[PDB]
């Protein structure tokens, strides 16, 4: 019955502090834990060990803005001067007798980040792809925040809904989101229209890029 209980989410504002809680099961309430951080798209990294007396020891190179503490069965991770890079899933983990177990993870959202408009690049099919008897329009969407856009495709002004595939947005190195949308055509379709357009809508603002054969 060794269980580490974490709330699935937490949130706090830029520059402020946040306290994350891990609760040990009652049969194991005196156990030490470790905190691990997993930033989006990355592997986990160790932050610190928190002992039953409330003392903690940070991993090599982990800054002092991360601290830990103990009250009863609860173990805490405190993060001060929150930055966008602290958006991550935080996992507590412990050492049982012959077993290790992880909590379910807490996803930390850092509020108050500035709005950022997407940058959009639209590419036509390459000659080499046309030589493979395919045609793909590639609409790449970067650097936006918050992380939601919608995409609409047009050919000579008319909506195009067949052949469209679009990814979900995901967080990037620069703390902004990215997505991409693909429009599959035949070579004949591509060559028959005067132009195709990718229209990206973000927070009520629509930008448009166009390509022509």
């Amino acid at each position: 019955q060794l269980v580490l209980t974490q709330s699935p989410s937490a949130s706090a504002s830029l520059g402020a502090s946040v306290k994350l809680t891990c609760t040990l099961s009652s049969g194991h309430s005196n156990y030490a834990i470790a905190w691990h951080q997993q930033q989006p798209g990355k592997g986990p990294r160790y932050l610190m060990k928190v002992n039953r007396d409330g003392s903690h020891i940070r991993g090599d190179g982990i800054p002092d803005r991360f601290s830990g503490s103990t009250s009863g069965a609860e173990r805490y991770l405190t993060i001060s001067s929150l930055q966008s890079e602290d958006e991550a899933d935080y996992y507590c983990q412990t050492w049982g007798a012959g077993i290790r177990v992880f909590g379910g993870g807490t996803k930390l959202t850092v509020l108050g980040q500035p709005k950022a408009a997407p940058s959009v690049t639209l590419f036509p099919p390459s000659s080499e792809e046309l030589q493979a008897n395919k045609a793909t329009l590639v609409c790449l969407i970067s650097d936006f925040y918050p992380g939601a856009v919608t995409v609409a495709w047009k050919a000579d002004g008319s909506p195009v809904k067949a052949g469209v595939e679009t990814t979900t947005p995901s967080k990037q190195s620069n703390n902004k989101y990215a997505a991409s949308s693909y429009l599959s055509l035949t070579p004949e379709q591509w060559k028959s229209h005067r132009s195709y357009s990718c229209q990206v809508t973000h927070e009520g603002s629509t930008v448009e890029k166009t390509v022509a054969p």
């Binding site: 996992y91 992880f102 993870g105 792809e129 970067s142 990814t167 990215a178």
Partner: protein
């Protein structure tokens, strides 16, 4: 510096056995427990098991009947074998350095060094390598379209790794065919579209595909 590096096939057919290795450099494996951990796409971390070569091994009770963990001191290496794999075993697999046990029986609990992770996909679909096409038209964007491959991942570099600033490789789209496609773009000076040559280098390890593509306007 102690470093951990997982490796294994990225594709496993259902009901067959997944074999992974954790190669440790910069220090010896002796005295520590070494743990295996996994994470299904978009889910939490799950401990698989651990090994201390000269003391004990054990594994998650949910997985114990299928888990074999061992070590090879001559290679400074840990191994995981997971038999009769299912879709639930699609995950990124990690190794990590765990508790140290001293000769006397005392020990120091730890979980302080993680490996990079290796991605494993369980699927009956055969591996398929990508077709790669150039993407071309202040700054300018050039890119490479990496089409119709399976399973994830592919890596993309530019100019053999000499170009890293302004390189953005986008997350893959998964098509109704069951195949992936992604794009990689480099942002460059407009003036340099004559001062420079741009080549994307695409690696798809499961199909042993390595191709280079020139991207020019």
């Amino acid at each position: 510096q102690v470093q951990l590096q997982e490796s294994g096939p990225g594709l496993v057919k259902p009901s067959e056995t997944l074999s992974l290795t954790c190669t440790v450099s910069g220090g010896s494996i002796s005295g520590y427990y070494w743990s295996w951990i996994r994470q299904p796409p978009g889910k939490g971390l799950e401990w698989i098991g651990y090994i201390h070569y000269s003391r004990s091994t054990n594994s998650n009770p949910a997985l114990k009947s299928r888990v074999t963990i061992s070590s090879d001191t001559s290679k400074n290496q840990l191994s995981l074998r997971l038999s009769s794999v299912t879709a639930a075993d699609t995950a990124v697999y990690y190794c990590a350095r765990d508790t140290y046990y001293y000769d006397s029986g005392d020990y120091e609990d730890a979980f302080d060094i993680w490996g990079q992770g290796t991605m494993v996909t369980v699927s009956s679909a055969s591996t398929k390598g990508p077709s790669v096409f150039p993407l071309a038209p202040g700054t300018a964007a050039l890119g490479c379209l990496v089409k119709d491959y399976f399973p994830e991942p592919v890596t993309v570099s530019w100019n053999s790794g000499a170009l890293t600033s302004g390189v953005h490789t986008f997350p893959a789209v998964l098509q109704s065919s069951g195949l992936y496609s992604l794009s990689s773009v480099v942002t460059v000076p407009s003036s340099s579209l004559g001062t420079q040559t741009y080549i994307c280098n695409v690696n798809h390890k499961p199909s042993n595909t390595k191709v280079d593509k020139k991207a020019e306007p």
